[PDB]
Symmetry: D3
Subunit: 69 residues, 6 copies
Amino acid sequence: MKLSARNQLAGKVVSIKEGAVNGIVVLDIGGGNQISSTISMDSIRELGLQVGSDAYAVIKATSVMIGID
Amino acid sequence: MKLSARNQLAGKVVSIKEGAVNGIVVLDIGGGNQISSTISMDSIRELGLQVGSDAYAVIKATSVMIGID
Amino acid sequence: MKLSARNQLAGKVVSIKEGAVNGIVVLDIGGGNQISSTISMDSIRELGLQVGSDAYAVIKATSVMIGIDDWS
Amino acid sequence: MKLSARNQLAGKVVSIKEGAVNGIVVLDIGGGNQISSTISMDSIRELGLQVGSDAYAVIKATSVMIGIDD
Amino acid sequence: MKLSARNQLAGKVVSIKEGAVNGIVVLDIGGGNQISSTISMDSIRELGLQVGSDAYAVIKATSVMIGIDD
Amino acid sequence: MKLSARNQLAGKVVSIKEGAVNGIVVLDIGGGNQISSTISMDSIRELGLQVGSDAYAVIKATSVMIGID
């Protein structure tokens, strides 16, 4: 399905640290960037996620803060 | 200050399209990826930021969803 | 793309409140319930959304709070 | 309290998945719709939530995305 | 309504910066702390918010990040 | 780093509830107020957080709702 979210970044799953209700999925999206996503275990199974899966990090623009040194 | 957020991606501001109270800053984070950030104009003033500034897109892991094809 | 968000509620657009950069879209999801979503006007244009369009309200489980009535 | 969040959908809890710190409450809100909510275990205790309790899924308008079929 | 969000901080509104669809309200929550909230102008109308209003800053635990000094 | 987030409230950690992937850190921020924050266990290690650490609750303005009686 097509999503309204402005951040939709392709990457590959390089870690999945499983837990009770939630889990943390890490995507390498190129450029030496990794995005970590905390989602429910139910979703990790439902989408089939495994180390090496192709995926997208989806982030709403209002979820992004800016920082500087 | 050092932040708990799992996602802290360094990038350069490639555009900043202003609006009334809010504003949308776009960061090139390398690998040809861009992050769009909606933050209040007060913060855009306070942090300085100009097209070409070094900055960070900071995203909490709980803000990221995963999608697949 | 298929999404990890546990809440993906089918509905029809019943209103679109335009603004300069943003807008408020309301979806009738059946059962007499409506969802409101604040998204960028750019996404509403790019997505084709119009009053009467079929769409989905997509919500992450961590974004939802639970409430109970004042007498519980 | 009366809450600023734009989405407040009434329903009955059909499951509560307990975990270490967090848990998932599922609401039937009628019309064949269910909302899943990930909240802390402390709130599920304090709110008295049990299977069959009447409750509300509360969602900010800014937390909702729109999707369409491609 | 009774709320699951653990952060429910009583305070008084000290300013309201109005905008097109949304607006920013600032609350004094005691201890010398101020919390800023961006919510739709529709909710600021519906709750009647004014400088001097009693209100609550409501924040979900999953929205709060932790920071420390270098 | 200097952050765009409107809410940065100084406090001391009063408990830390450990979990699988996440944990809940509570801050005394003065005025008898406590902020509860659910963040990843990796962030809790990395920041060194212990009961009694000085820290900040950092919250985006768009994450905050208002309620009245």
